[PDB]
Design an enzyme around this catalytic site. Sequence first.
Site, PDB file in Angstrom:
ATOM      1  N   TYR A 187       0.949  -1.532  -0.481  1.00  0.00           N
ATOM      2  CA  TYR A 187      -0.017   0.073   0.167  1.00  0.00           C
ATOM      3  C   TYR A 187       0.768   1.133   0.404  1.00  0.00           C
ATOM      4  O   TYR A 187       0.660   2.288  -0.559  1.00  0.00           O
ATOM      5  CB  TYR A 187      -1.183   0.348   0.904  1.00  0.00           C
ATOM      6  CG  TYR A 187      -2.202   1.165   0.780  1.00  0.00           C
ATOM      7  CD1 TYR A 187      -3.108   0.697   0.486  1.00  0.00           C
ATOM      8  CD2 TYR A 187      -1.793   2.450   1.247  1.00  0.00           C
ATOM      9  CE1 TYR A 187      -4.327   1.495   0.072  1.00  0.00           C
ATOM     10  CE2 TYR A 187      -3.165   3.467   0.938  1.00  0.00           C
ATOM     11  CZ  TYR A 187      -4.254   3.333   0.334  1.00  0.00           C
ATOM     12  OH  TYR A 187      -4.928   3.694   0.434  1.00  0.00           O
ATOM     13  N   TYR A 188       2.020   0.837   0.558  1.00  0.00           N
ATOM     14  CA  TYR A 188       3.349   2.459   1.018  1.00  0.00           C
ATOM     15  C   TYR A 188       3.652   2.022  -0.415  1.00  0.00           C
ATOM     16  O   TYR A 188       4.732   0.967  -0.249  1.00  0.00           O
ATOM     17  CB  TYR A 188       3.373   2.373   2.445  1.00  0.00           C
ATOM     18  CG  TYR A 188       2.409   2.827   3.489  1.00  0.00           C
ATOM     19  CD1 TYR A 188       2.372   4.124   3.169  1.00  0.00           C
ATOM     20  CD2 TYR A 188       1.512   2.127   3.966  1.00  0.00           C
ATOM     21  CE1 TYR A 188       0.931   5.042   4.286  1.00  0.00           C
ATOM     22  CE2 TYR A 188       0.202   2.795   4.536  1.00  0.00           C
ATOM     23  CZ  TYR A 188       0.399   4.009   5.335  1.00  0.00           C
ATOM     24  OH  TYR A 188      -0.993   4.454   5.808  1.00  0.00           O
TER      25      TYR A 188
END
Length: 223
Positions: free
Chosen positions: A18-19
């Site tokens: 996600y990051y």
Amino acid sequence: MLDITTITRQNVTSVVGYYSDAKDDYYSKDSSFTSWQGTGAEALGLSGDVESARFKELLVGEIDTFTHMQRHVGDAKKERLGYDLTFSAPKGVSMQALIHGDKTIIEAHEKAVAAAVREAEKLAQARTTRQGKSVTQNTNNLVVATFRHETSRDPDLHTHAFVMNMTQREDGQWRALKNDELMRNKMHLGDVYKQELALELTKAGYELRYNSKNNTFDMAHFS
Ligand SMILES: [Mn+3]
């Protein structure tokens, strides 16, 4: 061995990948830590290292700029975005890989995950409408982003095989996975990983210890 986490809009910020770093297009370019897998991924022209921007698009159903999936029929925060199938190696196996740096173990682990992923594809379904009536279509294709984690510390070799909530129907349309067959086959998929891992290790020449009680294995002479 196998854990399955259902990702929705409510827990998305906890999903693998996600990051990312703004400077990088990939999480780890020129390595096997990430890879696209599944016949759906290939249908999308996706292979090799996972591009973080693309991963995040697919996460939320963005096939392309003109094509966003509608998977929400109800509360919008409930929409399933995907399923993290986390495959974990036995402790001794993890120690051999991560504490001894045995690249052979890493490769066998990867093969076993690939095998389990291929088995997962058999369970892929999508709802459709033949002639007014609803029928379940076996689609045999998944889009999967895999992320290998090599946690040296208490050694834990595992891979997040993230199954997107999508599959390609016979008509070419991308639709949400009907996850029922996937969910009731969690134990099967875990055993596929376990069997393929044992098979690969045995073929490489490694001595394995079997536990009859619960039908598992680990490296001979190791946790
Ligand atoms: Mn992890």
